[PDB]
Amino acid sequence: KMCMNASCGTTSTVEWKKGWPLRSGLLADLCYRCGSAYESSLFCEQFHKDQSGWRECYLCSKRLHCGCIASKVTIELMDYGGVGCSTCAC
Amino acid sequence: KMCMNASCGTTSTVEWKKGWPLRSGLLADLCYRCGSAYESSLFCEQFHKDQSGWRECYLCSKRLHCGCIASKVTIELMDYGGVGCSTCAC
Numbered sequence: 001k002m003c004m005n006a007s008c009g010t011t012s013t014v015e016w017k018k019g020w021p022l023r024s025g026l027l028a029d030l031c032y033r034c035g036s037a038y039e040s041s042l043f044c045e046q047f048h049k050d051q052s053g054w055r056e057c058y059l060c061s062k063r064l065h066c067g068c069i070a071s072k073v074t075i076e077l078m079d080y081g082g083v084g085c086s087t088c089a090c
Numbered sequence: 091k092m093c094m095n096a097s098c099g100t101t102s103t104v105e106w107k108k109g110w111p112l113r114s115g116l117l118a119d120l121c122y123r124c125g126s127a128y129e130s131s132l133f134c135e136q137f138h139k140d141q142s143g144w145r146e147c148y149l150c151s152k153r154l155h156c157g158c159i160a161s162k163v164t165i166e167l168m169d170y171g172g173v174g175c176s177t178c179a180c
């Protein structure tokens with residue numbers, strides 16, 4: 001196992017964890033630190049701050065990391081453009 | 091019918107066209123101008139230049155409008171972050 005957080009990529013951790021669904025449909029491997037962040041639903045806030053792709057929810061203005069598999073399940077693409085939190089879209 | 095391009099929204103056009111799949115699974119209505127842009131695969135280049143969400147393909151650096159239903163079918167979310175054109179990912 002290797003942690004699938006590119007900025008991390010450790011092979012040693014006190015405990016392995018699971019992350020997002022891969023394009024294979026299988027579930028990514030994360031180290032204890034990165035996996036804890038993912039479970040907290042703050043993976044992209046913690047690791048992808050500098051990256052391109054951030055938009056704002058159309059209703060609450062929460063920052064949403066688009067074009068990113070790690071946040072895919074929490075972002076709704078809206079019918080006429082833009083994105084919403086799963087809360088605010090549904 | 092009303093063109094589902096928010097910057098447009100006309101109700102009069104010489105010819106109606108179809109756009110992206112809606113979250114209902116049905117297919118959006120676009121006027122002749124916006125629909126032509128969509129068929130050309132340059133809708134987001136033509137209308138969403140100023141918007142947030144643009145990333146670069148991990149391999150060819152093409153600009154890809156993420157968090158956007160109009161480009162959803164042309165963008166692959168990669169297993170470890172970032173995006174690729176359908177060409178470069180597959």
Ligand SMILES: [Zn+2]
Pocket residue numbers: 003004005008009010030031032033034035
């Ligand atoms: Zn890690």
Ligand SMILES: [Zn+2]
Pocket residue numbers: 043044048065068069070071
């Ligand atoms: Zn992210």
Ligand SMILES: [Zn+2]
Pocket residue numbers: 057058059060061062084085087088
């Ligand atoms: Zn929201």
Ligand SMILES: [Zn+2]
Pocket residue numbers: 093094095098099100120121122123124125
């Ligand atoms: Zn139009």
Ligand SMILES: [Zn+2]
Pocket residue numbers: 133134138155158159160161
């Ligand atoms: Zn777009």
Ligand SMILES: [Zn+2]
Pocket residue numbers: 147148149150151152174175177178
């Ligand atoms: Zn590409």
